[PDB]
Amino acid sequence: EALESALATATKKKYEQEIDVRVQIDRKSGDFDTFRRWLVVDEVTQPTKEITLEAARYEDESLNLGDYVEDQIESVDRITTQTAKQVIVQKVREAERAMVVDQFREHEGEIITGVVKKVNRDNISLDLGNNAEAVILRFRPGDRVRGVLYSVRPEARGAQLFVTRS
């Protein structure tokens, strides 16, 4: 998934006026194929990645809105490994972050302290010097915050430990 997302980003940065290109490969011997997809929508917003419902008419209008995967596969470099390696090492840090989440749950049940990094509206952050991070639902960076976590929701691009006080 990290490799196909890196190739998708590499093909995205390659083209100028063509965005939202995906690629799926889940086999060892099976090579990867780059099939650029369009967003199924009845409007004309984003004319570079939008498609009409008449293309789904071949499927008897079975493709409901919100899911956009259908198109003919097109033609599929060593320089692409530069951005590919960055995505790989990024997911390793995310996988290592999930390891700290599992280790935290094994030793959970005590009040912890955290340092705020940024003051995003309705979402602060915490800091623990163990390659970990936590956020609290709605301080200034540099102050220690006391909070007990109770649940973790699967946030996009990696889950985050949600902490609550009330």
Partner 1 sequence: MNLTELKNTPVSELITLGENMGLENLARMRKQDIIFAILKQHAKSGEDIFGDGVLEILGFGFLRSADSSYLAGPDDIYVSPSQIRRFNLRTGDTISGKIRPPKEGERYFALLKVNEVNFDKPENARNKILFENLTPLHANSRLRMERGNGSTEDLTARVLDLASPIGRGQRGLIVAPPKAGKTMLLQNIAQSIAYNHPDCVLMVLLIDERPEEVTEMQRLVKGEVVASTFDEPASRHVQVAEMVIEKAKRLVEHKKDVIILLDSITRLARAYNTVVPASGKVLTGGVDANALHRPKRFFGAARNVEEGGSLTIIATALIDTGSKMDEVIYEEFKGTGNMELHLSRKIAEKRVFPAIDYNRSGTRKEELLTTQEELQKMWILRKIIHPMGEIDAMEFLINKLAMTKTNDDFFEMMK
Partner 2 sequence: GPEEITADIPNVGEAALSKLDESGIVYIGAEVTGGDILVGKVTPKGSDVKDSSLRVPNGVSGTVIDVQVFTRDGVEKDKRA
Partner 3 sequence: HYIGDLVQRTEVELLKTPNLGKKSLTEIKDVLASRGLSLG
Question: Is residue 86 close enough to count as binding partner 2 by CB under 8 A?
Answer: no
Task: Candidates 29, 67, 79, 138: give the one binding partner 2 (CB under 8 A).
Answer: 79
Binding of partner 1 by 62 (CB under 8 A): yes
Return d(Cα 91, Cα 49) in angstroms, integer: 27
Taking the least distance from each CB to partner 1, the nearer of 2 and 159 is 159
C-alpha torsion 67→68→73→74, nearest 10: -150
Q: Which of 48, 81, 120, 131 binds partner 2 (CB under 8 A)?
A: 81
Q: Enumerate residues 6+ apart whose C-beta is below 8 A from 152.
A: 101, 159, 160, 161, 162
> What, of partner 3, partner 2, partner 1, none, does residue 77 touch, CB below 5 to 8 Å by kind?
partner 2
- The reply to whether 82 sits near partner 2 by the rule CB under 8 A is yes
Asked whether position 95 contacts partner 3 by CB under 8 A, the answer is no
Q: Does 18 bind partner 1 (CB under 8 A)?
A: no
Within 10 angstroms of residue 159's Cβ, the number of other Cβ atoms is 14
Q: Is 146 left (phi over 0), alpha (psi -120 to 50) or beta?
A: beta
Residue 54 binds to partner 3 (criterion: CB under 8 A): yes
Residues near partner 1 (CB under 8 A):
59-60, 62-63, 70, 72, 102, 105-106, 108-109, 150-151, 153-155, 159
Residues near partner 2 (CB under 8 A):
77-79, 81-82
